[PDB]
Design a protein around this nucleic acid. Structure first.
Ligand SMILES: Nc1ncnc2c1ncn2[C@@H]1O[C@H](COP(=O)(O)OP(=O)(O)O)[C@@H](O)[C@H]1O
Ligand SMILES: [Mg+2]
Length: 399
RNA sequence: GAAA
């Protein structure tokens, strides 16, 4: 197996992408390095799968070994990493000030905005990790229903971050708060999209009253890439609902310029460039990535294999329903057209007005519909259904 | 974000 050795000076990153076919293994063999804010352990072997795009950054200097076939691999001397560090530094300063002002203190809340493929999710992740590394537990809010790093696509979610992200597997998705939107873009139903993140914000505000460390941890809010048209007023409502202190605009000067005139004067607005290592992804790639996210939801990762159950449910034992006038519930009769669709297990016990603004327990996928036997087969993360009320998502998956 |  073929090996590549890289010497990184201080403030450089090794940018590489694993091949189309094979894995690439990475090992820090000298110095200190981090991958999107998580510290690498000396001499540990991190196996990344095909098509991964990764940057290992060092503040002090590093020597790194890559084993396996790469599509690209190079050391970059210029990065915006200090910018990202300074935003974290600034956040922690606000925390101290507010803690001292509370002899309960509320941490800073930061909204990241900008178009797709600017490294927004990556920055969110760096910022969450740096807070954890500072001793804090931030709440990561994920409003991107398309490319969601917390739950399945078609959801709006939040997780309390208590551990740095796993280098390979991202953050722990333990006990998130998940709302089912049911579409991959907000433009499919914008009034429902706003209702859901408004209920996210209110729910979060109540939950943090019972948790001092989460309250002072603050929020890092990742948004989707829809910054034009109605997408724009939606950024302003999200900044309002979550009472954000800071808006970070990534690589969009007109957007930065427009928010500067509309946001309240107390809201700090910063424009940062995208990293030279962010690469543009096609729709085929993002579609494939939505699929892998679904697969992960049920089957977990290589390091943490999850073992889901495939069992039959009677149509008499459940109620199928669908949201969408934009915010009305509709009872669905079992049909062949629900095959391959995700369904959310609602926390509402009855199919009524409560379903809309209720978070969900989790998701199943309908694999078979047996109309003659009046049963469906579902793939499910647990043994028995946690709720009898099943809410439709337009997201489909072939297992 | 998603669609073409
Ligand atoms: N500095 C970097 N070097 C190499 N790859 C990167 C870097 N920053 C981000 N990436 C990769 O680029 C892709 C897009 O990044 P992402 O944060 O998802 O962008 P956005 O969320 O704005 O669409 C991801 O695969 C990510 O791992
Ligand atoms: Mg993103």
């Amino acid at each position: 197996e073929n090996v590549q050795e890289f010497v990184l000076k201080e403030d450089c990153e090794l940018r590489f992408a694993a091949g189309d076919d094979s894995d690439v293994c990475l090992e820090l063999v000298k110095g200190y390095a981090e991958i999107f804010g998580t510290e690498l352990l000396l001499n540990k072997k991190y196996t990344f799968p095909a098509k991964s795009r990764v940057a290992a950054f060092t503040w002090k200097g590093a020597t790194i070994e890559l084993v396996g076939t790469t599509e690209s691999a190079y050391v970059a001397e210029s990065t915006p990493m200090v910018i990202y560090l300074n935003i974290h530094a600034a956040m922690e300063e606000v925390r101290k000030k507010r803690e001292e002002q509370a002899a309960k203190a509320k941490g800073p809340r930061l909204l990241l905005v900008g178009p797709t493929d600017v490294g927004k999710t990556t920055v969110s992740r760096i910022l969450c990790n740096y807070s954890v590394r500072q001793g804090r537990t931030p709440i990561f809010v994920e409003l991107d229903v398309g490319q969601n790093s917390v739950s399945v696509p078609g959801t709006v979610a939040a997780v309390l971050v208590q551990k740095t992200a796993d280098v390979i597997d991202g953050f722990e998705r333990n006990q998130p708060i998940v709302f089912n939107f049911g579409h991959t873009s907000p433009s499919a139903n914008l009034s429902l999209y706003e209702a859901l993140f408004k209920e996210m914000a209110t729910t979060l505000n109540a939950q943090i009253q019972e948790n001092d460390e989460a309250k002072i941890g603050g929020m890092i809010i990742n948004t989707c890439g829809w910054v034009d048209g109605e997408g724009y007023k939606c950024i302003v409502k999200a900044a309002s609902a979550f009472e954000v202190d800071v808006v970070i605009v990534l690589d969009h000067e007109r957007l930065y310029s427009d928010l500067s005139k509309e946001l309240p004067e107390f809201v700090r607005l910063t424009h940062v460039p995208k990293s030279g290592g962010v690469e543009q992804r096609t729709g085929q790639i993002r579609s494939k990535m939505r699929g892998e996210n679904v697969h992960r939801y049920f089957y977990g990762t290589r390091a943490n294999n999850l073992y889901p159950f495939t069992f039959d449910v009677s149509f008499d034992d459940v109620t199928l329903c669908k949201i969408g006038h934009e915010t009305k519930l509709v009872i669905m009769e079992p049909s062949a057209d629900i095959k391959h669709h995700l369904f959310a297990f609602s926390r509402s016990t009855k199919a009524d007005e409560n379903v809309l603004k209720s978070p969900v327990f989790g998701f199943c996928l309908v694999t078979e519909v047996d109309l003659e036997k009046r049963t469906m087969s579902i793939l499910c993360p647990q043994r028995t259904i946690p709720s009898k009320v099943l809410v439709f998502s337009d997201i489909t998956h072939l297992d």
